[PDB]
Design a protein around this ligand. Structure first.
Ligand SMILES: NC(=O)c1ccc[n+]([C@@H]2O[C@H](COP(=O)([O-])OP(=O)(O)OC[C@H]3O[C@@H](n4cnc5c(N)ncnc54)[C@H](O)[C@@H]3O)[C@@H](O)[C@H]2O)c1
Ligand SMILES: NC(=O)c1ccc[n+]([C@@H]2O[C@H](COP(=O)([O-])OP(=O)(O)OC[C@H]3O[C@@H](n4cnc5c(N)ncnc54)[C@H](O)[C@@H]3O)[C@@H](O)[C@H]2O)c1
Ligand SMILES: NC(=O)c1ccc[n+]([C@@H]2O[C@H](COP(=O)([O-])OP(=O)(O)OC[C@H]3O[C@@H](n4cnc5c(N)ncnc54)[C@H](O)[C@@H]3O)[C@@H](O)[C@H]2O)c1
Ligand SMILES: [K+]
Lengths: 462, 452, 450, 444
């Protein structure tokens, strides 16, 4: 088991985390506004704790450790990252609220409990976005870095830099575009942070409701779609030149993601038209196109409040929230390939009923899927459902009402995280236990459910 | 001609057996001597035991003194390497090579006709078999359909079951290409002229344009109802290929006996349903509606299980059955019986090989009924002076005993043979031997003999 | 009746398939479950997967509640041990057991009928097949020869050809007249009424019933005893094959073609006086080389059904006098009806028959499944006295025989008296009768009980 | 460098594992994916499942962008056809191809060194293993014998024992006097070989002499072992049967092979050796055929375990010396200080004869040696060169290198000598990682 070498990496991560507290503390002195005393206190307690772990160890004793690590990287960092939100008495808030905010931030969940953040220090807002960006790194380099410790192909750090480039040249390339449709530079960096990491956080309390310019709506759309799409597939970018074109429409995952996105938009728009929910048949287009992409690709950004929207729409959206993001991107539903495969497998099951003596094979790209991964997919879907209904019960038991707990789980298990059900969205003043529950819910939602579930099987140890 | 045949087994066997019929010097090389013993006993030819791709072995076979290297074995890679070795080490004249793998002849031009892999002609035998079957399918009621000049003229065959009328009187009705090249009544055919009585249960050979053939077939007897649902037993090369082809225009069920073969088959073709199991069990058959199926094609290697499976499938009531029967004696055994059409896969390869053992003046040759008869497409590459055929008319040429001109192809026009038409330079002549042994005459009769 | 069948393989299959036809409770145990799948799907019976000789398995199968243990597997040792275990652990009633190995039934009496190895009846299936073939050979022109009362009365069967029959029965019968009566004649699918004055159509299958002594003579002056067989060739050197060989090899000259080398090599010493050929039953080479044209009978006995039928047809084309094919798949047997195959030997007609003798009670002593298996022919005793039995004392046309039944003969000790409508049934006498449809057999059984 | 390796089987495996050692881009193609699983898991390289001779597969592997086609499969014909297809469809640069069949390279020139079969270099691995063994036999007391310039200079290796050496290094050199010591390994890593070094026991010493005066050097070295007379080899495979057919002339050889047909065929394919069908294990065959009167017991079956084991048994029944072929490294380490006299890993032969075609033209022969961590190369070479004017001691060889010999046409010259144009230089790297430097130092 050797947890002794695990702590080395843990402390090393607390220190590596400390050196990112100097980033919104560099905005607590730059932008004259507010208090950055916490960020520099945190940069100290974290560096100290971390180095107090790394130093009494130093042993690179390079499975079950891989798991324990990829639960530590969140459970520890998302706890540590709740430290600025504590000491700072500018948005002075409860400890449980602080944890909710930190975990939701780092997970790229994007569900706030601080109402009235429009008028807060330019640092504590930047910290909020920076967290999302940093976690938005994790969720995609753990689609690479896991392989040595763990298994994706058990069911190379050549690309560790190479991903950070596609990521950086996307957040930058977005920040410019945001500030070209005219946000303040601060608001255009801190919104590219969120829009690339598919997190949902904002500076405005109404998110993408500042300037209803279709410019920014339709920028956020186009950068969400890209960010919501398979960085390993994007990796056909730096390697050779711009020979991107064919690679995308080759992979059937992406090919499916596009059909899904289109169909979803189409029905949404057409219903916003039939119902006369919008004055001009342009705003209908705008709101539909932005909302489907934002809510379904696990983004979270809202540009409306679903006032005239036929109830069928935020519901169908909240459900499509279950499948969002080319696999190995910054999204985090039960990722697109899962649903593709699932539909294939079920279609098969439906075929076997007719001709039962026949040999049917699951086909994705060319080669068939082995009956070890179909099993895994189905098991995953089941587990997913289980987890969802369990946390929904945990919340209804906490005190919350039925529909609200439903929206809550459905929003934290996918990491959306607007209420989205029937206008009961706001987490700030929800029950205190419920907040903890929801934190769990989004840890499950991040870790794809299995890699935490196994942590509490007896079989894991030892 | 003296030919070296690389590979005894499946194809080299019938190939040798046929080329020995005509007087040639045949030496045949093979991997294991047990396959060699049999033809050594039977057909009086010289045998070479050894790996058919080694220089010393080719030497032992006579690669230096040969006129043709028929490199036809089970393995592609060895066939090719054999042609390579034979060319750069013995300069062996004519190098045909059996290639199975589709992703080789995918670049047929880029890989062989470039002198890179010194193969003169490729010959994919199974492909010939599948094409033959497919044709037999897209022309319901046919017993054999061979097309010649770039699929423009077509010799077709049908049992008389519609007819029963005046021979030259039915030909007028009703606008009209086809003439009867031959009619088998008992064992040998009869002279087909204006005054033949059309008997029942005869095997008739039409020859028309490849366009107006389904049409001739229409005004014939009982244009049979187009096939919808097809079931093939045996998921081998011939089988799986017939599947992969037919699966578009038709609905196809494929039963294969080995699991792994079936399982891999299951992903190799996205439009057919692959069944692992035996071509025998009435259970699976009835369960998959063998009574609602239009044609039952047997294509497993065991001959017995093919014939038997077919007869069983006709008892549980498949409309039609196509059985592949490689041993001739069986083909003769199942004559007047239930089997609708028997496909010998020698008539497919012997035919497409003989096109390369006979000279350039004939471009296509095709073994037919029992193999004793033959049908060829001969070009007339001469002048009114140097050639003895061109310039003359049809009824005026001294054709070998038991031969009949059937059609003539001028560029893209197809002109069926009446006694008056004139043979021109660069014209193709589709004619019909009743006995292949008078083929050297046809060959000589179409060659620019030196008149000086 | 509820029977447990040990072994769902070769024989246990058809045995189950038949005992299920009549309404019985069948549980069938087998080594491997794949053979069990098929009859589970098909015939509505309970199935037990597991080693057919283990206590827990017998238990799972119902050794306690059953009436008969049909122990028919591949291995002798397991069958024997099975009856032993079933007897001393469940006291399971009727224990039949398949024994193949000859040096066991060498001491048949000394080893089984002594309660040491608790086998009630032994039943060696292949010996019945070899015996059947042998008979079909020593009675040229016969399609089936079944003997009843200690081989004293004999039901025989023969096809109508262009030569022998083909005339009015009661006008032509005078020419061969006479003790035999016709029990049944199949014209198409079902027979027609055989009395003193019935007319004979062509291509019928006729069933005679005479004394077993006066039958070979009857076969002769009836107009169709074929010229005696001299040279015999059998393909397939398995149990049926090699045994038929060892028997025939005395009275006849025999060539035996077997495909596996080791089998052939061992066969070569296991039988002196026969010539063993290693090679395939198909290749025209071996056949013509060994005078397949001079052979009187070509008997196919390989396990591959298809190759048997085909090889036989081939051997008839290159001109064997007669062909005997063994066809275990029924559909094939019907497929090859009007054709070249002279006689098709289904090795069920041999074992179903000698097994049914133990599922029907004591009033029936010999039973024999016949045409398609749908029909039956039984030797029923009228075990009673002038008072207690309804069968004894009445006359044949006067006893209420089940629909589609025909008395054929009566056996008194060592005497054989053929059945006419008037005869007197006496105590402890045997009655040989013929059902065209087996389903009216429970009737015949009750009809002969006190 | 980016190489395509055809065949994840026996050799292509170790080949991938080693060419991955130096930082290269390796794609490896194979018939069956199970063999692909392991190296995919282990060595972090790209894998292509499919027939290694199909155009679409080669394409999928990157035949277009590759620099070298290491075509090493089981079948000859497919390897050849592979080089052909890759050449005429993708113009793939460097085409090595394993050829086993003898009657191909019988006309090696007429069939390969032409544009008929586009094979750039042939590489027959088993023949090398057998050559290695053969040499180990005709030079008694050697642990490794590698010959360089057309078998004219020879690097040889020998263990120091409690008896044989144990004297002043360059002081014993005064007695013999044409040979210099390329290297001396004392524990795991070597030591500086110069004029005044103390000879400890259990050291591994590397001579470099003329290939003529090497058996003679071995003689006055005071350790030429008594000539072998009786030889017994178990395993009638490629390596076994070939070593047999070679040794069968100068020596008496008994060959125990387990498969009957293989043995029966062996029995006619090679006259003058005695073929025994049976297991390398049973004391029966061994004692009945005098495993006690035998000089060397050479194990050459594919099962590693039965090789090691049979060898140990044969040393118990008292064979003089035992040679075991052990392909699994862990085993080779397991049986170190023990009874096995010499362990022959058949990687030391193929890694070596493959590296000759991944390293540039300035190096013609390379030979992996001790643990594979060290290397020994033959480099060919007044204005353009850094070498051709200097003396042996005058050129700046990379850290831990030693020139050993120089081959001028047909001459062999073993600190003062002068390097001339078109001369061969047999030198010895202690750490192969410094080979690209030597490579540059010999380039115009
Ligand atoms: N073009 C040619 O290659 C050629 C030329 C002349 C003759 N032939 C003959 O045609 C045959 C078919 O060629 P192929 O390559 O398609 O055959 P093949 O060798 O691929 O085998 C045929 C398939 O039928 C399957 N099969 C399914 N059900 C079966 C059953 N119940 N019993 C037995 N087998 C069953 C077998 O498993 C096998 O996969 C060859 O074996 C050869 O004898 C072929
Ligand atoms: N009484 C019984 O045992 C019984 C009862 C019912 C059915 N059967 C059936 O009768 C068959 C014969 O019984 P058996 O015990 O003698 O069979 P078996 O298992 O001994 O096999 C028959 C032999 O024929 C051989 N053979 C020779 N030439 C052949 C060729 N050209 N093609 C195929 N096979 C060839 C086979 O190799 C085999 O050795 C059995 O397979 C069984 O299905 C037997
Ligand atoms: N150059 C190379 O070919 C090469 C390169 C690297 C590794 N290797 C390894 O070296 C091994 C030897 O190569 P090869 O091609 O000569 O071997 P091989 O595959 O020809 O087989 C060796 C023979 O020894 C036989 N044998 C005899 N007695 C035996 C016993 N008691 N137990 C087990 N087997 C017995 C085996 O049956 C087999 O026939 C290979 O297995 C390979 O993994 C070879
Ligand atoms: K989000």
């Amino acid at each position: 088991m050797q947890f002794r070498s695990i702590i080395r990496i843990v402390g090393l991560l607390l220190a590596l985390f400390s050196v990112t507290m100097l980033a919104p503390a560099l905005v607590a002195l730059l932008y004259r506004d507010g208090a950055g005393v916490p960020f520099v206190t945190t940069f100290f307690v974290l560096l100290f704790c971390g180095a107090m772990c790394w130093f009494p160890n130093r042993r690179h004793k390079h499975s079950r450790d891989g798991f324990l690590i990829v639960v530590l990287f969140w459970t520890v960092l998302g706890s540590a990252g709740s430290l600025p939100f504590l000491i700072a008495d500018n948005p002075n808030i409860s400890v449980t609220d602080a944890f909710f905010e930190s975990f939701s931030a780092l997970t790229t969940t994007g569900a706030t409990v601080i109402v009235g953040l429009d008028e807060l220090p330019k640092a504590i807002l930047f910290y909020r976005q920076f967290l999302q960006w940093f976690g938005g790194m994790g969720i995609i380099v753990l689609a690479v870095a896991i392989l040595p410790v763990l298994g994706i192909g058990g069911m190379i750090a050549e690309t560790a830099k190479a991903l950070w480039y596609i990521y950086l040249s996307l957040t930058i390339a977005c920040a410019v575009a945001f500030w070209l449709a005219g946000m303040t530079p601060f608001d255009a960096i801190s919104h590219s942070f969120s829009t690339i990491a598919i997190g949902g956080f904002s500076t405005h309390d109404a998110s993408m409701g500042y300037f209803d310019s279709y410019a920014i709506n339709l920028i956020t759309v186009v950068f969400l779609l890209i960010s919501a799409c398979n960085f390993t597939l994007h990796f056909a970018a730096f390697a050779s030149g711009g020979v991107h074109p064919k690679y995308y429409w080759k992979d059937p995952e992406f090919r499916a993601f596009i059909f899904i996105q289109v169909l979803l938009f189409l029905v949404c728009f057409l219903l916003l038209l039939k119902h006369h929910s919008y004055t001009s048949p342009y705003d209908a287009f705008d709101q539909a196109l932005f909302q489907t992409v934002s809510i379904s690709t696990t983004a979270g950004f809202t540009t409306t409040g679903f006032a005239d929207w036929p109830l069928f729409l935020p519901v169908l959206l909240l459900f499509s929230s279950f499948i969002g993001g080319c696999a190995g991107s910054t999204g985090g539903g039960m990722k697109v390939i899962r649903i593709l495969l699932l539909t294939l497998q079920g279609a098969r099951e439906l075929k076997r009923l007719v001709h039962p003596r026949a040999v049917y094979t699951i086909k994705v790209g060319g080669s068939a899927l082995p009956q070890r991964v179909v099993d895994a997919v189905w098991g995953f879907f089941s587990a997913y459902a289980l987890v969802f209904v369990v946390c929904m019960l945990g919340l209804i038991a906490t005190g919350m009402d039925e529909l609200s707990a439903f929206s809550a789980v459905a929003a934290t298990l996918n990491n959306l995280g607007p209420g989205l059900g029937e206008v009961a969205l706001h987490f700030g003043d929800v029950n205190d236990k419920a907040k903890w529950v929801l934190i769990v819910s989004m840890l499950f939602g991040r870790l794809e459910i299995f890699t935490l579930l196994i942590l509490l099987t007896p079989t894991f140890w030892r | 001609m003296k030919i070296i045949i690389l590979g005894a087994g499946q194809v080299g066997g019938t190939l040798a057996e046929n080329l020995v019929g005509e007087n040639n010097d045949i030496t045949i090389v093979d991997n294991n001597a047990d396959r060699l013993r049999e033809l050594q006993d039977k057909y009086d030819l010289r045998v070479v035991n050894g790996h058919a791709s080694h220089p010393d072995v080719l030497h032992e076979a006579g690669a230096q003194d040969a006129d043709m290297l028929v490199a036809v074995t089970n393995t592609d890679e060895t066939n090719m390497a054999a042609c390579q070795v034979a060319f750069t080490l013995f300069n062996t004249p004519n190098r045909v090579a059996r290639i199975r793998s589709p992703e080789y002849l995918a670049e047929k031009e880029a890989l062989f006709k470039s002198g890179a892999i010194p193969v003169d002609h490729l010959i994919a035998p199974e492909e010939l078999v599948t094409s033959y079957i497919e044709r037999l399918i897209q022309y319901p009621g046919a017993l054999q359909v061979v097309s010649f000049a770039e699929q423009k003229v077509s010799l077709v065959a049908v049992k008389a079951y519609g007819p029963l009328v005046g021979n030259a009187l039915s030909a007028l009705r009703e606008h009209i290409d086809t003439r009867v090249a031959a009619i088998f009544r008992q064992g040998r055919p009869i002279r087909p002229q204006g005054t033949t009585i059309i008997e029942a249960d005869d095997e008739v050979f039409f020859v028309a344009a490849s366009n107006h053939i389904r049409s001739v077939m229409s005004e014939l007897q009982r244009l049979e109802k187009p096939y919808r649902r097809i079931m093939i037993v045996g998921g081998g090369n011939i089988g799986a290929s017939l599947a992969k082809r037919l699966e578009q225009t038709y609905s196809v069920k494929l039963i294969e006996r080995d699991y792994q073969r079936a399982e891999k088959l299951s992903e190799q073709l996205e439009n057919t349903i692959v069944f692992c199991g035996d071509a025998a069990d009435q259970e699976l058959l009835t369960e998959e509606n063998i009574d609602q199926v239009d044609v039952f094609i047997a294509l497993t290697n065991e001959d017995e299980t093919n014939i038997m499976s077919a007869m069983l499938a006709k008892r549980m009531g498949a409309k039609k059955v196509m059985v592949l029967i490689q041993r001739g004696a069986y083909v003769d055994l199942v004559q007047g019986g239930v089997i609708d059409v028997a496909i010998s896969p020698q008539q497919a390869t012997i035919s497409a090989l003989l096109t390369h053992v006979r000279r350039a003046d004939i471009v296509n040759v095709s073994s037919l009924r029992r193999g004793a008869a033959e049908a060829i497409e001969a070009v007339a590459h001469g002048d009114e002076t140097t050639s003895k055929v061109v310039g003359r008319a049809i009824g005026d040429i001294k054709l070998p005993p038991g031969t009949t001109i059937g059609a003539v192809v001028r560029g893209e026009e197809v002109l069926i043979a009446h006694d008056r038409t004139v043979i021109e330079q660069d014209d193709h002549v589709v004619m019909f031997l009743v006995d292949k042994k008078y083929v050297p005459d046809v060959e000589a009769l179409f060659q620019p003999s030196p008149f000086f």
